[PDB]
Amino acid sequence: SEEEIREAFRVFDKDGNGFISAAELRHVMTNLGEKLTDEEVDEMIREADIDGDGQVNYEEFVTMMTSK
């Protein structure tokens, strides 16, 4: 359960600094076959960004991942 979510986070957090950045999210999305504007990527960060620092920490990832 939690090891799967930690693993998914690591796939996005490519530099391992504990924060998914816009550039990292662009990268992952692009290499799954998506063509995204700077606008659409920012929009994706906002799905999870709660403190409004413009990136997704692990805690923010958890709560996006476990709510629907």
Binding site: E7, F9, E47, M64, M65
Partner: peptide
């Protein structure tokens, strides 16, 4: 390949783009 949780994260991240592609 996507590790299942990553696919769920990809769909969740895509929520607003998906909604707006559904409209268009």
């Amino acid at each position: 390949d996507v590790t299942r949780a990553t696919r769920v994260a990809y769909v969740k991240f895509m929520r607003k783009k998906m909604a707006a592609d559904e409209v268009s």
